[PDB]
Amino acid sequence: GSHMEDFVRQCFNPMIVELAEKAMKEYGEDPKIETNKFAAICTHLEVCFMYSDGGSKHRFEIIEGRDRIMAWTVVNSICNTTGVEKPKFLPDLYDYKENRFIDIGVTRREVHIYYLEKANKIKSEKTHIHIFSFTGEEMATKADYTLDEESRARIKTRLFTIRQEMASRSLWDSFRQSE
Ligand SMILES: Cc1cn([C@H]2C[C@H](O)[C@@H](COP(=O)(O)O)O2)c(=O)[nH]c1=O
Ligand SMILES: [Mn+2]
């Protein structure tokens, strides 16, 4: 029974916590042992939902947060109706305005490096990438950041708050060093 586990449960809403637990169980991991991962998944989930909330109504299809089978079903529906190429890995959102898949990343390290490591790993030229860090930096494909500055600013504010809460509990160093 770790401090990080109870921190995560008292910091994130129950809907995110439950989706994160399901994700980890589907992968096969355990929230009680792999607790920095539990925190990372919750964080990613929240950011992806804050981000979809940044557009106009119906701008984004939300892929993140669904069961893997249903996630791919929706990806295939989008592909088969917009003629866009099918990605090799599951993205997080689809942008109906710009007609592209997006993969949002959240890193405790250098944005630059996480971006690159994401580009290669994706192996899907068409998928747009947008990285945020816990220090307030962001990096987007072709410097096209999708949302307006205010919607991104609130994401960054939220990440820095998570960082502080963790640091006040002496959990940050461990979370930072475990990426
Ligand atoms: C950075 C990081 C992400 N993740 C998770 C968050 C997401 O659920 C999933 C995809 O993350 P990404 O899109 O930020 O790469 O992997 C970890 O489990 N551990 C980590 O250290
Ligand atoms: Mn992502």
Nearest-angstrom CA–CA distance, 7 and 175: 12
Domain interval for residue 160: 1-179
What is each CA distance from 86 to 3, 127, 154, 155, in whole angstroms? 41, 9, 31, 28
Task: Identify residue 179 by its one-letter amino acid code.
Answer: E
Give me the number of domains the chain comprises.
Answer: 1
Q: Which of 133, 143, 125, 132 lies closest to 104, judged by CA?
A: 132
Burial classification of residue 5, based on how many CB atoms lie within 10 Å of its CB (0-12 exposed, 13-18 middle, 19 or more buried): middle
Q: Which residue has the tokens 């589907």?
A: 26
| Catalytic position from the list 37, 46, 92, 103 | 92
Q: At what angle do helices 35-52 and 3-11 cross, to 10 degrees?
A: 20
Q: Which conformational region is residue 21 in: left (phi greater than 0), alpha (psi within -120 to 50 degrees), or beta? A: alpha
Burial classification of residue 32, based on how many CB atoms lie within 10 Å of its CB (0-12 exposed, 13-18 middle, 19 or more buried): exposed
104 CA distance to ligand 2 centroid (A)?
4
Name the CA dihedral angle for 4, 136, 146, 92, rounded to a multiple of 10 degrees: -20
**CATH code, 165:** 3.40.91.90
31 CA distance to ligand 2 centroid (A)?
19
Active site residue 30: no
What is the 3-class SS of the chain, one letter each residue?
A: CCHHHHHHHHHCCHHHHHHHHHHHHHHCCCCCCCHHHHHHHHHHHHHHHHHHCCCCCCCEEECCCCCHHHHHHHHHHHHHHHCCCCCCCCCCEEECCCCEEEEEEEECCCHHHHHHHHHHHHCCCCCEEEEEECCCCEEEHHHCCCCCHHHHHHHHHHHHHHHHHHHHCCCHHHHHHCC
Tell me if 179 CB under 6 Å of ligand 1: yes
85 CA distance to ligand 1 centroid (A)?
23
Q: Which of 109, 80, 82, 78 lies closest to 92, judged by CA?
A: 78
Tell me if 19 CB under 6 Å of ligand 1: no
How many angstroms is the resolution? 2.1
Bridge partner residues of 176 (DSSP): none
Tell me if 107 CB under 6 Å of ligand 1: yes
Report the Cα–Cα distance between both ends of the chain, in Å, rounded: 21
Q: How was this structure determined?
A: X-ray
Beta carbons within 10 angstroms of residue 155's beta carbon: 23
Q: Which residue has the tokens 């945020």?
A: 132
Tell me if 105 CB under 6 Å of ligand 1: yes
Active site residue 103: no
Active site residue 92: yes
